Ligand binder design. Structure first.
Ligand code: CLA
Ligand code: CLA
Ligand code: CLA
Ligand code: CLA
Ligand code: CLA
Ligand code: CLA
Ligand code: CLA
Ligand SMILES: CCCCCCCCCCCCCCCCCC(=O)OC[C@H](CO[C@@H]1O[C@H](CO)[C@H](O)[C@H](O)[C@H]1O)OC(=O)CCCCCCCCCCCCCCCCC
Ligand SMILES: CCCCCCCCCCCCCCCC(=O)OC[C@H](COP(=O)(O)OC[C@@H](O)CO)OC(=O)CCCCCCCCCCCCCCC
Ligand SMILES: CC1=C(/C=C/C(C)=C\C=C\C(C)=C\C=C\C=C(C)/C=C/C=C(C)/C=C/C2=C(C)CCCC2(C)C)C(C)(C)CCC1
Ligand SMILES: CC1=C(C/C=C(\C)CCC[C@H](C)CCC[C@H](C)CCCC(C)C)C(=O)c2ccccc2C1=O
Ligand code: SF4
Lengths: 80, 87, 160, 160, 742, 34, 142
């Protein structure tokens, strides 16, 4: 549904994963930062699109980026 | 309350107000309604004659109406009101 | 000029002076002549008569409504309507703009530059509010020396 | 002690309140023509039509525009029968959209208890087909019988 | 266990904490970095729960803030008595009030504003006041302006005492947490000591001061020759000539011969025909009764003397089979959360202020209150707006209790837990009754507008068309008029004149009150009122119930109260917060209270307020057009919003021209609100970025970065200008129209 | 007016029948699963 | 990492019933089951609205959305020291285990998971939309 993209400006601060309320983001190993980890979005079909990860990203400009695309019953947040 | 043997009973698929009574009428009342409402069954057929029959029945009494039945077919019954500037 | 009679010879402007005192004279009829609210209306009438004798003596132009109209084109007769108090204004408004600009330069080279804007340093402020008196000689002086404007390589620019 | 969860399950969005699972209310709601799961859906659709057909003559003969004439029986009954024919087409296009020809039944097969019942045939393409014709014949006869008992026989009532 | 717990010198009285602005919050103590720091400085200024987690220091902050509020109200009362003493015509109005308008504000003759000092009468120029202070001082027995000056300087003394107590109960001896948690003692000393002894003391004033002075004012005696209030206490024969029951001298009180006090303690009812205001023998019997009843009710709870009630024992014994473990933990709610008590107290104070508004137009308590129509309209309108604001704030602090003080571990299977457990049912059935009320009131208005537009007056809901007579109200008004004969014997007359007992009271040639009719128009507008109150309840109760979580956002309590949104996800989560429900309920309070005061103004300008000529003929201000024009929106726009606005727009060049200026400036503030309400932060942030670029070009960049207002702040600014502009529009239109035709 | 009865025909069809034709055919069309 | 199997014999927390629970999306589309092991009998805030007494052993809770499982799960990870996992249950009977996928929570890094949805460039090196007209690819997915 929603497309969440991680860019190489990430410092591995992990707070995009901690702010995620639908378990989209996970921290995979990486070689481009001091923390040696970058975020990724394997369960991007579960993304509501709330951009809590973009609110918690301290990198200017943002490393996690959520693009609101086709919206399904996962990304609409319904219970009915 | 999760079972893995009955998936409908653990998810809310309940007939909350349903009944399993097979019949409560008699054969004389049942044969009258299916005979009369037998040409009204098919959705594609019923949508055809309701649109075509509904367009005719509003154009009939729209046109055969009288002055007392509807005021738009009565017309004016007094002198017209002249506007300002002689118009 | 522009089809407007002068207000000293305008019959409509003298009509508005007549019907303004008459409104205030009828307000005076229900008070005692030595009472305190009657002294306020008597001071209002003398304020009105001072106003109408000031508007006619400045060469104001009155239309068909009996009202003084301002000519802002830059006429040699009409300098005090727009040009003279505009140059008085822009001197005062440039004084506000020069002492607020010079305060920000004086607090940008400080230890905590953001605490000097919520808490304005009055000895730093009052020593340049006096310096805003001669500001056209200091604004064009900074314009000619290049200190008024900042080069675009050191200015935060949003991307295309 | 009085309020229970819905069939003992607290995580289904409902409660077993007295307005829901009374001895009198759950007897009532289980005999209403919409919740008979084994009756053929044309027969129980005639009762859903007779009811709604009858009741709708009332607000159309006592409140409509032609309520102050001698044609108030004829104007309001055909207005009541007009709402039957519109809602029949609303019932027609609902069954076309919701149910496809040859599909299963979108109905809960399980009852309040754990016993397995047959699927409700009303939520099908052919079950809602016979339900729509049951509402059309029942609704047009429910309007006409309420018109007969009010403006043909003219039974005495306080308001008519 | 109830006793005084204080401790000495918690914080030192120093100005070093005045210099640092954001000392209360950890985020604002670092100093400013953006311009949003200034707005969070004011937003978190009074929010004492966000400062510290210790409820003791929070309660001390709230107690000294109460004392500062009391100081501000005493400064305000000092000003209004000093304005009566020096800048008013209160002695001139008190000589004859049927011809001289109440005025207590003189403006300075500077810029043409001296025309606002209008001819109010009595040889005086000033702003005609509508606050009702003149009738209040006439009911208090105030005869001279020296008494007003003495009350002003006494109020200044009490304002200094409240400032000293606010300093004392935060810096010298501040109470501890268990002192504030003695709610039984606080209720015992508020019911008996505050509302009981206050009613008893005002009853003593209304026996000795208000009653004989106001009896002499009904006799046409000049107030300069009326004896002073202490002369009735000293010379009791002077008090006995007006009431012979004073000749017995306190012996019927202790011998239970209270009927011998029937000369000055009566259950008359109705209005004084001399003045148009309630009797003070009834207002003194009223205060003596609510004092002998609030002092009884103040001996109910258990402090430390054995007798009484623990209210936890009252609550925990109140449990039912439809609830189970209900009312348990609510004592722990209402003694550990300031916001829950604030919600209950604000709901009662707002609803009580609405009670005050109705029980003052209908039973006017002050002499010449009813016949001064400006005072009646302004007092009703002011108390409706205060009451609506306080009930919206009640729902606000209810929601703040949910998001910041509701502990789910202490609340299992009680009333609050079960109300949260079926909040979908509450909000959905409230939604149904709101939509049903909206059609069955406003669509009835639309139907009347349509058939009046289509030339069908018989197809409407009129008193001549299809009638919708309020038979319950028309029966309860007959039940309240035909009461004295059988259900309430000992009454001389009836409770109010608006019930149907006759008594066309004419004071100064102007109608005080008469029987208020209730017809189809009143039915329609009362269903509008019920609809608007229900919808305001719907947004506000939805914000209270969905403050913790929702089906949309299950972690909404972690986001807080003043958060804007979660984001553009789940379709968009804009205004999910409980604050945003308070924000929308403020608009629905505008709608509700504005239609309430519009129905009030038109209903009594059409059916109550007017004049009485010879041979008993009553000519109202807008004669009889409420029954036929207030059933359509075109009548409301035409015979109310256009016909009665023909004195707010042509008031220019007169004393009421400031009402025209504030009418237009109130339209300005309203259209200014629509800038903040309809727009959003990011547009203004990029526009400010362009302005910051222009500042960078000329080296006038501030170090405090210019930022757009926050989304919560932009909505707050928009609703503040919407309420301020619309309320000031109605204030200007009301206070120009009813002053002009009054 | 030449023919007064075509007001009595076309205003009921284009005002009542044609929205009932168009909205019912669209609601079938917008809820086709295809 | 072997995913845990849903036992379907552990019981529910003591809850009086809520109206915020499973609607018809549970019956036809999906519903979410969260399973966790408890130290003792506690009281927790229900993410559908309300409070329930959680059991002294393993607990099973049926939820409608994936966000309700994290809102509950982060509540009993910070207030309580309880490890949790949840599932996705479909009406045909298939239980899809969802979190944590490797057995360790996604805040902590694991060597088994791979980078997906990761761009080696930044935002400023994304291509303009004018040079990607009429293509399935967009400015960020390449
Ligand atoms: C410290 C003084 C200072 C200086 C020299 C200027 C000068 C500048 N500003 Mg301004 N401005 C300031 C204060 C200042 N401003 C402050 C305090 C605010 C907040 C109200 C702004 C808000 C602002 C806006 C909204 C705009 C400008 C713009 C401008 C330009 C034209 C003047 C104008 O539009 O009228 C002045 C505009 C005002 C809104 C009046 C604010 C001036 C206050 C009263 C002075 C306070 C100074 C004092 C020490 C504190 C010019 C570059 C425009 C621009 O982008 O450049 C072309 C524009 O769009 N400014
Ligand atoms: C019989 C004693 C008594 C009485 C008269 C009151 C009266 C009052 N209380 Mg108090 N209170 C008492 C004892 C009493 N209290 C007890 C025992 C407790 C402890 C459990 C509390 C704790 C409490 C708190 C925590 C607060 C109050 C507040 C209030 C005020 C109500 C708000 C208001 O605007 O009212 C109308 C206000 C007035 C009429 C002003 C009157 C002020 C004068 C100086 C009297 C007050 C002094 C003292 C209480 C009684 C002295 C009597 C004196 C006249 C002889 C009012 C001053 C509230 C307030 O505003 O805080 C300041 C507040 O929330 N009370
Ligand atoms: C708190 C209010 C209050 C206060 C301070 C007063 C004060 C006074 N009353 Mg009382 N009184 C009050 C309530 C009050 N009364 C009420 C409500 C009634 C109705 C029962 C009266 C009716 C009353 C009478 C009948 C008389 C007093 C009298 C007295 C005086 C002597 C008693 C005393 O001081 O003790 C004193 C001036 C006596 C007096 O000297 O009159 C001025 C007197 O004869 N009182
Ligand atoms: C008994 C009265 C009472 C109590 C104790 C409080 C107490 C509180 N309120 Mg409030 N509340 C109440 C009633 C009250 N309120 C009412 C009347 C409303 C409806 C408007 C609400 C709605 C409510 C909400 C919506 C929220 C609170 C919150 C706050 C908290 C701090 C706000 C702050 O720092 O002030 C800030 C003060 C200002 C910004 C001053 C602005 C004043 C108004 C808005 C504009 C000016 C009006 C003025 C008359 C017009 C003059 C114009 C002229 C100058 C040109 C605090 C707990 C906030 C909070 O976080 O609570 C924890 C918040 O989010 N309140
Ligand atoms: C005149 C302007 C206007 C109108 C028409 C509406 C209409 C609505 N508002 Mg309101 N409201 C408005 C301005 C308006 N609002 C603004 C200013 C705000 C922003 C603050 C709000 C925000 C809002 C909130 C936040 C809430 C409402 C809700 C509602 C509903 C109230 C129930 C009702 O009356 O149903 C009857 C419908 C009407 C009277 C609309 C006219 C329909 C006519 C009568 C029917 C005939 C037309 C015909 C079928 C055409 C063919 C209704 C749909 C409430 C809601 O949805 O729950 C009840 C809700 O909670 N309002
Ligand atoms: C877009 C152009 C236009 C518009 C705005 C209308 C508007 C109107 N027509 Mg129409 N009319 C049109 C085209 C137009 N006409 C043309 C070209 C013809 C000549 C054949 C007619 C012949 C006609 C008749 C005979 C009658 C009206 C009538 C009316 C009224 C009721 C609607 C109705 O029954 O439609 C009926 C429409 C038609 C019979 C043909 C409409 C064909 C148009 C071009 C379709 C346009 C679709 C549009 C572009 C999509 C958006 C209404 C005022 C009635 C009237 O006078 O009311 C009292 C009526 O009796 N119309
Ligand atoms: C251009 C649009 C259109 C037209 C032609 C009409 C026409 C009519 N309206 Mg209606 N209306 C419409 C739009 C329309 N409406 C909309 C948009 C609104 C919503 C705001 C309303 C709201 C409204 C209400 C609330 C009511 C009317 C009523 C009326 C009737 C007034 C004349 C009379 O006295 O008959 C008196 C009545 C009769 C002669 C009864 C005739 C009923 C016939 C026989 C129905 C027959 C079946 C029908 C044709 C099936 C339709 C199929 C489908 C294809 C359209 C008339 C039938 C009144 C009425 O009586 O409704 C029937 C009434 O109560 N209107
Ligand atoms: C009566 C109203 C004045 C009350 C002042 C009380 C108070 O703050 O002063 C009591 C203050 C307490 O002194 C405080 O000491 C702190 C260091 O501990 C800092 O220096 C504070 O600036 C200083 O206010 O005593 C003073 O030194 C008086 C000067 C400040 C008062 C100025 C009044 C204007
Ligand atoms: C206003 C009166 C509405 C009647 C309500 C009334 O009579 O309450 C009766 C019932 C009382 O329940 P219990 O017997 O559990 O109450 C014991 C009380 O002490 C509550 O603790 O209250 C409810 O269950 C609320 C039902 C509201 C139902 C919706 C009404 C809206
Ligand atoms: C000074 C100045 C200026 C001016 C200004 C202007 C421009 C104006 C605007 C304004 C407007 C254009 C409007 C406004 C309006 C106002 C208002 C509106 C206000 C209000 C206030 C208040 C305070 C209120 C009160 C109230 C209340 C609160 C409630 C009830 C009612 C009332 C009213 C009483 C300028 C800038 C030039 C320059 C600088 C300075
Ligand atoms: C206009 C507007 C702004 C911009 C508002 C701003 C920047 C507030 C301006 C406040 C004053 C005018 C600036 C600060 C003034 C200083 C005290 C300096 C004094 C200068 C003169 C006022 C004397 C928003 O941020 C916004 C956010 C969300 C929705 C709508 C809107 C919105 O409509
Ligand atoms: S929050 Fe931003 S910087 Fe931190 S790990 Fe996530 S993407 Fe990287």
């Amino acid at each position: 549904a929603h497309s969440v993209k991680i860019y190489d400006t990430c410092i591995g601060c992990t707070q995009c994963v901690r702010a995620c309320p639908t378990d989209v983001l996970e921290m995979v190993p990486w070689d481009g930062c001091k923390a040696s980890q970058i975020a990724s979005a394997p369960r991007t079909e579960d993304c509501v699109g709330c951009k809590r990860c973009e609110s918690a990203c301290p990198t200017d400009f943002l490393s996690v980026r959520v693009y609101l695309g086709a919206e399904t019953t996962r990304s609409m947040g319904l219970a009915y | 309350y999760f079972d893995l043997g009955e998936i409908d009973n653990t998810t809310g698929n309940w007939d909350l107000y349903g009944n399993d009574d097979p019949n409560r009428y008699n054969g004389f009342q049942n044969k009258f309604f299916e005979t009369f409402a037998g040409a009204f069954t098919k959705r594609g057929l019923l949508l055809k004659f309701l649109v075509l029959g509904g367009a005719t029945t509003i154009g009939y009494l729209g046109s055969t109406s009288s002055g007392d039945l509807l005021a738009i077919k009565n017309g004016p019954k007094q002198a017209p009101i002249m506007g300002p500037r002689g118009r | 000029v522009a089809g407007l009679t002068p207000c000293k010879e305008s019959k409509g402007f003298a009509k508005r002076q007549k019907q303004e005192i008459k409104k205030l004279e009828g307000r005076l009829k229900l008070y005692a002549p030595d009472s305190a609210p009657a002294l306020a209306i008597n001071a209002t009438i003398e304020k009105t008569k001072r106003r109408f004798e000031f508007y006619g003596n400045q060469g104001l132009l009155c239309g068909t409504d009996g009202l003084p109209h301002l000519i802002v084109d830059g006429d040699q007769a009409h300098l005090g309507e727009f040009v003279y108090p505009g140059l008085v204004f822009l001197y005062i408004a440039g004084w506000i703009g020069w002492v607020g600009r010079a305060y920000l330069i004086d607090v940008r080279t400080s230890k905590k530059p953001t605490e000097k804007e919520i808490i304005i340093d009055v000895p730093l402020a009052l020593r340049i509010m006096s310096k805003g008196l001669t500001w056209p000689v200091a604004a064009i002086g900074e314009l000619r020396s290049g200190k008024l404007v900042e080069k675009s390589s050191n200015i935060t620019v949003s991307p295309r | 002690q009085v309020i229970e969860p819905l069939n003992g399950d607290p995580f289904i969005g409902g409660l077993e309140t007295p307005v829901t699972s009374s001895p009198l209310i759950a007897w009532y709601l289980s005999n209403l023509p919409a919740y008979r799961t084994a009756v053929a859906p044309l027969l129980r659709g005639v009762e859903i039509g007779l009811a709604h057909g009858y009741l709708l003559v009332g607000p159309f003969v006592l409140a409509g525009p032609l309520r102050n004439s001698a044609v108030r029986g004829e104007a309001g009954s055909l207005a009541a029968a007009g709402l039957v024919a519109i809602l029949t087409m609303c019932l027609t296009i609902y069954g076309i959209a919701s149910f496809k020809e040859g599909e299963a039944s979108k109905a809960p097969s399980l009852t309040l208890t754990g016993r397995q019942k047959a699927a409700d045939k009303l939520q099908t393409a052919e079950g809602w087909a016979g339900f729509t014709g049951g509402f059309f014949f029942g609704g047009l006869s429910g309007v006409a019988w309420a018109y007969i008992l009010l403006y043909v026989l003219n039974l005495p009532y306080p308001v008519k | 266990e109830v006793k005084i717990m204080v401790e000495k010198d918690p914080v030192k009285t120093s100005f070093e904490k005045w210099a640092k602005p954001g000392h209360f919050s950890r985020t604002l103590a670092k100093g400013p970095n953006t311009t949003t720091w200034i707005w969070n400085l004011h937003a978190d200024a009074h929010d004492f729960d966000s400062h510290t987690n210790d409820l003791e220091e929070i309660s001390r902050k709230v107690f000294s803030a109460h004392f500062g509020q009391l100081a501000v109200i005493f400064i305000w009362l000092s000003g209004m008595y000093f304005h009566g003493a020096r800048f008013s015509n209160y002695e001139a109005w008190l000589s004859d009030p049927t011809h001289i308008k109440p005025s207590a504000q003189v403006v300075w003759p500077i810029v043409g504003q001296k025309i606002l000092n209008g001819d109010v009468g009595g040889g005086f120029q000033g702003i005609q006041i509508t606050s009702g202070f003149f009738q209040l001082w006439r009911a208090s027995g105030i005869t001279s302006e020296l008494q007003l000056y003495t009350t002003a300087i006494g109020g200044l003394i009490f304002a200094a005492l409240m400032l000293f107590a606010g300093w004392f109960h935060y810096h010298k001896a501040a109470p501890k947490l268990a002192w504030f948690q003695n709610v039984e003692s606080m209720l015992n000393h508020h019911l008996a000591g505050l509302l009981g002894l206050g009613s008893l003391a005002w009853a003593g004033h209304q026996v000795h001061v208000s009653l004989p002075i106001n009896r002499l004012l009904d006799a046409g005696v000049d107030p300069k020759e009326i004896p002073l209030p202490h002369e009735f206490i000293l010379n009791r024969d002077l008090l006995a000539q007006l009431y012979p029951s004073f000749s017995k001298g306190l012996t019927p009180f202790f011998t239970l011969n209270w009927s011998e006090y029937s000369d000055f303690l009566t259950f008359r009812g109705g209005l004084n025909p001399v003045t148009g205001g309630l009797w003070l023998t009834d207002t003194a019997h009223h205060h003596l009764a609510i004092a002998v009843l609030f002092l009884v009710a103040g001996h109910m709870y258990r402090t430390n003397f054995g007798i009484g009630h623990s209210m936890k024992e009252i609550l925990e014994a109140h449990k039912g089979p439809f609830t189970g473990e209900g009312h348990k933990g609510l004592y722990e709610i209402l003694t550990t959360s300031w916001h829950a008590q604030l919600a209950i107290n604000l709901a009662m104070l707002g609803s009580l202020t609405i009670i005050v508004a109705h029980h003052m137009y209908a039973m006017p308590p002050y002499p010449y209150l009813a016949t001064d129509y400006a005072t009646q309209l302004s007092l009703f309108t002011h108390h409706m707006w205060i009451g609506g604001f306080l009930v919206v704030g009640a729902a606000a602090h209810a929601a703040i209790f949910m998001v910041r003080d509701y502990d789910p571990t202490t609340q299992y299977n009680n009333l609050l837990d079960r109300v949260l457990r079926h909040r979908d049912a509450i909000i959905s059935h409230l939604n149904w009754v709101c939509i049903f009320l909206g059609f069955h009131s406003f669509g009835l208005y639309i139907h009347n507008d349509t058939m009046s537009a289509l030339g069908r007056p018989q197809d409407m809901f009129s008193d001549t068309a299809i009638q919708l007579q309020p038979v319950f109200a028309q029966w309860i008004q007959n039940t309240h008029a035909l009461a004295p004969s059988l259900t309430a014997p000992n009454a001389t007359a009836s409770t109010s004149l608006t019930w149907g007992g006759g008594d066309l009271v004419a004071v100064g040639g102007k109608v005080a009150l008469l029987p208020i009719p209730l017809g189809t128009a009143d039915f329609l507008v009362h269903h509008i009122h019920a609809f608007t109150i229900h919808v305001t309840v719907l947004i506000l109760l939805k914000g209270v119930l969905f403050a913790r979580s929702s089906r949309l956002i299950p972690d909404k309590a972690n986001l807080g109260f003043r958060f804007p949104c979660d984001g553009p996800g789940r379709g968009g989560t804009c205004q999910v917060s409980a604050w945003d429900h308070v924000f929308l309920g403020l608009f629905w309070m505008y709608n509700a209270i504005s239609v309430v005061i519009f129905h009030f103004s038109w209903k009594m300008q059409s059916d109550v307020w007017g004049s009485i000529s010879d041979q008993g003929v009553v000519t109202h201000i807008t004669g009889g057009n409420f029954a036929q024009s207030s059933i359509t929106i075109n009548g409301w726009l035409r015979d109310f919003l256009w016909a009665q606005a023909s004195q707010v727009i042509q008031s220019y060049g007169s004393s009421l021209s400031a009402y025209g200026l504030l009418f237009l400036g109130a339209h300005f503030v309203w259209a200014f609100s629509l800038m903040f309400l309809f727009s959003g932060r990011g547009y203004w942030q990029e526009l400010i970025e362009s302005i910051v670029w222009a500042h960078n070009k000329l080296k006038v960049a501030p170090a405090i970065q210019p930022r757009a207002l926050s989304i919560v702040q932009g909505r707050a600014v928009g609703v503040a200008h919407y309420l301020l502009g619309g309320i000031a529009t109605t204030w200007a239109f009301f206070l120009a129209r009813i002053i002009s035709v009054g | 007016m030449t023919a007064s009865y075509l007001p009595s025909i076309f205003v009921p069809l284009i005002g009542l029948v044609f929205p009932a034709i168009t909205m019912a055919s669209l609601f079938i069309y917008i809820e086709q699963d295809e | 990492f072997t995913p845990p199997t849903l036992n379907a014999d552990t019981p529910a927390p003591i809850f009086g019933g809520s109206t915020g629970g499973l609607l018809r999306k549970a019956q036809v589309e999906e519903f979410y089951v969260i399973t966790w092991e408890s130290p003792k009998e506690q009281i927790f805030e229900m993410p559908t609205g309300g409070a329930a007494i959680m059991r002294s052993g393993p607990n099973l809770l049926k939820l409608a959305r994936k966000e309700q499982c994290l809102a509950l799960g982060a509540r009993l990870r910070t207030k309580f020291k309880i490890q949790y996992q949840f599932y996705r249950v479909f009406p045909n009977g298939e239980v899809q285990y969802l979190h944590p996928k490797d057995g360790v929570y996604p805040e902590k890094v694991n060597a088994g998971r791979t980078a997906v949805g990761v761009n080696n460039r930044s935002i400023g090196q994304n291509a303009n939309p004018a040079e990607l007209k009429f293509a399935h690819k967009q400015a960020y997915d390449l």
